[PDB]
Design a protein around this ligand. Structure first.
Ligand code: HEM
Ligand code: HEM
Ligand code: HEM
Ligand code: HEM
Lengths: 140, 129, 140, 129
């Protein structure tokens, strides 16, 4: 699936994201809620900014999920089964929303990393892509 | 948008001699089955709902030239009140096409499909903010 | 991924398709060409109608692969490996064209099949979407 | 689309104080690598092409309140000429946004991102069919 080159960059990024999951997660979601307002209806939040208390806790869950996913690039199907069913069967999240959150996660990274070359962006987009494809595989 | 007398006739005739109410009803139930996530937006009977939708589409037929302004209130509704991703509107129309394709069988040539695809591609524009 | 009930009705469709792969395939492509002109840009043909000689020949190749694909639902990834490297890295097909062909194949079936209920539609769609996910996964 | 005063300022001030030529250049480069299939459409130098694009986006801020018309022919070229898929236009602007985020870092808040997102949304609408 991934080349040892991508597993490399993906590793560094994960190490970074792991230092402050809430901080990053909160920003990602805040960016999502501003550029894709329709996505606000899935959450019962007062404040939808990065300062929102609930936005931060959840953000941390999302980032940790992404970080954990990075440690299982070799077998994401099984790893994300539960998460896939949660988004697909339980929450009924419109697939359209996945690419938007991924793009927001990417912009957040570009905003915080000293280096974010197309090559690095490629590997991250590859991971994000795989993650989202599994998360939209259990509707039917 | 330009409208041929042929494209105007094909669409005009269908809404006049075919039970679109039934077509849309089955199109909705089809959408709910093929694209499960569309159910969350409706949480009601498609049987009765179809009528309102057909009511709006029949309207767009009577004013084919400018649906954009005719649907300004529908857009806002689906956009701000329903929160329907602008990318999911075609899921319903595609199903209506499949229902029509099923009805007319081989009388639904690529040409005829192109007409409806045009009609709906226009109706989607007039509904997506 | 696929349930016995889905494999079964899918298997009933591949049967119909296998009878005249050329006729079905030529109709799909033609529908695709008429509804999304931009796709013509990938094929240098004199005739884009279903009567075209290249449309028919190619059309049968497409349907024959969709049929072969149905017999390998359990290992689509490894089965479509070469076909994906061809449409991806080789032909650089905009992934946006795939779902367009899918609907055309779906519409074509709704025209010949005696029965195309939401249940069957759903099963074919799952097959097609699964095939497409593979064909748009190897651009490098 | 209604442009808040602050919004207008942000766009125009950026096209004046920032080096958009090299931002767009880098964006085209990013796009070609991240979304490989985009190369197909260009079968020319990115650095040179960048000026053209930034040139068009510039005329856009000049006629912000009326992009659809100023981009009339521009879209015709992208469609019945180069055949670019309407659902691929966001790939470039998305890349322009990443380049912008990488340059402004912390100053590129969710709120400012939303201004640019809103701007390219209307630019994408104008240049696509
Ligand atoms: C793209 C990657 C995504 C990841 C890694 C992700 C991860 C998560 C995780 C880890 C949870 C918590 C699961 C639990 O313990 O119950 C969750 C819940 C949820 N996610 Fe996502 N998610 C993703 C995308 C999305 C998208 C696009 C939406 C919708 C815009 C979404 C909507 C939700 C909602 C509404 C919940 C339930 C939150 C609650 O408990 O109130 N997620 N997600
Ligand atoms: C482009 C085709 C569509 C047309 C012509 C259309 C038309 C209508 C009309 C006329 C109403 C009546 C509500 C009112 O007048 O206040 C309605 C309601 C609604 N539509 Fe659509 N719609 C379209 C697509 C969609 C899609 C694709 C979805 C979801 C996936 C959707 C979700 C809803 C919901 C949830 C309601 C609310 C029902 C209610 O009034 O309680 N619509 N639609
Ligand atoms: C449903 C998914 C599709 C299937 C099952 C499929 C199947 C095929 C097969 C089996 C071949 C021949 C392989 C070979 O001879 O090496 C082929 C070639 C090709 N396909 Fe597809 N294809 C699909 C979608 C598309 C789409 C969306 C496009 C673009 C509109 C496309 C463009 C092409 C082109 C240009 C060729 C090259 C053949 C030639 O003229 O030499 N395909 N496809
Ligand atoms: C929405 C952002 C975009 C803007 C503002 C834009 C603007 C321009 C302009 C002004 C030109 C030259 C006009 C002329 O020659 O008369 C051009 C050419 C071109 N654009 Fe875009 N473009 C955009 C998106 C895209 C995308 C996404 C693609 C496809 C990946 C694309 C493919 C092309 C091609 C192939 C040319 C080169 C023409 C040549 O060198 O012969 N453009 N674009």
């Amino acid at each position: 699936a991934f080349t040892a080159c991508e597993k490399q960059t993906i590793g560094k990024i994960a190490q970074v994201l792991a230092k402050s999951p809430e901080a990053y997660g909160a920003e990602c979601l805040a960016r999502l809620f501003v550029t894709h307002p329709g996505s606000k209806s899935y959450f019962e939040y007062k404040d939808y900014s990065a300062a929102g208390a609930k936005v931060q806790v959840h953000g941390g869950k999302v980032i940790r999920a992404v970080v954990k996913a990075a440690e299982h690039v070799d077998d994401l199907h099984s790893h994300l089964e539960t998460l896939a069913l949660t988004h697909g069967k339980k929450l009924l999240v419109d697939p359209q929303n996945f690419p938007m959150l991924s793009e927001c996660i990417i912009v957040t990274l570009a905003t915080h990393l000293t280096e974010f070359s197309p090559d690095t962006h490629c590997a991250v987009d590859k991971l994000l892509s795989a993650i989202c494809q599994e998360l939209s595989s259990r509707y039917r | 948008v330009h409208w041929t007398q042929e494209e105007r006739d094909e669409i005009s005739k269908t809404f006049q001699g075919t039970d679109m109410k039934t077509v849309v009803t089955q199109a909705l139930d089809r959408m709910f089955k093929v694209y499960p996530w569309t159910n969350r937006y409706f949480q009601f009977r498609s049987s009765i709902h179809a009528g309102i939708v057909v009511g709006a589409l029949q309207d767009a037929v009577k004013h084919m030239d400018d649906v954009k302004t005719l649907f300004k209130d529908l857009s806002k509704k689906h956009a701000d009140d329903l929160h329907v991703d602008p990318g999911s509107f075609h899921l319903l129309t595609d199903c209506i096409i499949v229902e029509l394709a099923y009805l007319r069988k081989d009388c639904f040539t690529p040409h005829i499909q192109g007409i409806w695809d045009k009609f709906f591609e226009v109706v989607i524009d007039a509904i997506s903010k």
